């Protein structure tokens, strides 16, 4: 049995800018059980159906997971733009796979704010699909070099979400899992 529980029920999730990727292989995957396994608020598959996923085999399955704002979940889809799609986690236009999300306010918000979850707010250019950027150099927003010194036009590139339990639903944390289905010239190991 594929260790989906390890991904979906992990105690901590990654920050979106440092999104985690888990490789799943050599196992049987029941995606109908996965679909019905909890109340997910988002469960959208692109080019595939979870019922038809049960009759397919893949070389590897990849599960990307992270936390974002509720208002940002729509950016975890092919063809989207915004601070998450552009600078944190980018799906390809031709994405095949599934996107699953659920409200995680009970786990990831703190009274006073959970500042452990971050996203990249400043970046010179957009991310390529499935690119990950974990640099934290002070970001030069003007003509004057920063030399590692924060100040006017010189910004730490990551921002904390600061999730609080009293946030409105759209600003509460949502845990997200993206499933990608890989086909290599190699024996199938996930069926």
């Amino acid at each position, epitope marked *: 049995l594929c260790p989906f529980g390890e991904v979906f029920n992990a105690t901590r999730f990654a920050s979106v800018y440092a999104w985690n990727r888990k490789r799943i292989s050599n196992c049987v995957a029941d995606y109908s059980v996965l679909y019905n396994s909890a109340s997910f608020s988002t469960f959208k598959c692109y080019g595939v159906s979870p019922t038809k996923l049960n009759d397919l085999c893949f070389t590897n399955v990849y599960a990307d997971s992270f936390v974002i704002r509720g*208002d940002e979940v729509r950016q975890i889809a092919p063809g989207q*733009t*915004g*601070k998450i799609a*552009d*600078y944190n986690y980018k799906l390809p236009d031709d994405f095949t796979g599934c996107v699953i999300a659920w409200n995680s306010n009970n786990l990831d918000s703190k009274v006073g704010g959970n500042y452990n979850y971050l996203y990249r*707010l*400043f*970046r*010179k*250019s*957009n991310l390529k699909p499935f690119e990950r950027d974990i640099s934290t150099e002070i*970001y*030069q*927003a*003007g*003509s*004057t070099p920063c030399n590692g010194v924060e100040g*006017f*036009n010189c910004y730490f590139p990551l*921002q904390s979400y*600061g999730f609080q339990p009293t*946030n*409105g*639903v*759209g*600003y509460q944390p949502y845990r997200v899992v993206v499933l990608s289905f890989e086909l290599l010239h190699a024996p199938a190991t996930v069926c």
Partner: single-chain antibody, 225 residues
Framework: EVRLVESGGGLIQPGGSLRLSCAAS????????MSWVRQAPGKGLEWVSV???????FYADSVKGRFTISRDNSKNTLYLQMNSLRAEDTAVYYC????????????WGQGTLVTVSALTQPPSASGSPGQSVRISCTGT?????????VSWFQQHPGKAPKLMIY???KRPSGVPDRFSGSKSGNTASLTVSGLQAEDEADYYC??????????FGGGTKLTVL
């Protein structure tokens, strides 16, 4: 010097077209959130468009499909192409750095006039010199009451708005600490204490409202009596 300098403008008939320019100094347009904000004569502020450092563009519902934001990195200049103009596009158009909530509109151009032929604030408020006044800004749980992306602006006649408070209670460098921002439930408040004649001005609140909607209050005129 840090500058944002608009050009272009004038009088157009409905269905006409105009392109505005915003030439920056020190601020690097291609590396920043850059926006246009407009103000119809005698009225409040309305966010128009933002251009992201990576090239993504977003637009207010009122202009989507008619306006286009763009830039020339070699000229360090931001542009607003405005097509299919209507009478209701009449406004002073400001460029500004920021997206209006994260990061806030901290730096503003001078404005340029184009003529084509919600958050609840009290219309007015007053206080006495050295005393205090509280300006309220009432939203809903999906904006003011749902997050901390609330800003406050001061605007004097003939000048661009000036960022006074961001993130509910944070003051930009140089803003006097007798300007204080807070929030209770769905209502944000700007408290101005130690009131001085120069505090006479219009004050606007702003809040992100989700789905790339940026809201401004209708403005409060502050009289110091």
């Amino acid at each position: 010097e840090v500058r944002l300098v608009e050009s272009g403008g004038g009088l157009i008939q409905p269905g006409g077209s105009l392109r505005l320019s915003c030439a920056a100094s020190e601020i690097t347009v291609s590396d920043n959130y850059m926006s246009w904000v407009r103000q119809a004569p005698g009225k409040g502020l309305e966010w128009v468009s933002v251009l992201y450092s990576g090239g993504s563009a977003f637009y207010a519902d009122s202009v989507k499909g008619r306006f286009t934001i763009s830039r020339d990195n070699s000229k360090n200049t931001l542009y607003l192409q405005m097509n299919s103009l209507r009478a209701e596009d009449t406004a002073v158009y400001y460029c500004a750095r920021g997206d209006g909530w994260e990061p806030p509109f901290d730096f503003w151009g001078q404005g340029t006039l184009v003529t084509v032929s919600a958050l609840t604030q009290p219309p007015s408020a007053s206080g006495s010199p050295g005393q205090s006044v509280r300006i309220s800004c009432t939203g809903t749980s999906s904006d003011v009451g749902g997050h901390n992306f609330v800003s406050w602006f001061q605007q004097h006649p003939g000048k661009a708005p000036k960022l006074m408070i961001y993130e509910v209670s944070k003051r930009p460098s140089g803003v006097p600490d007798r300007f204080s921002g807070s929030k209770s439930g769905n209502t944000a408040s700007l408290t101005v204490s130690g009131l001085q004649a120069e505090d006479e001005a219009d004050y606007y609140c702003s809040s992100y409202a989700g789905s790339n909607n940026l809201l401004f209050g209708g403005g409060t005129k502050l009289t110091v009596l």
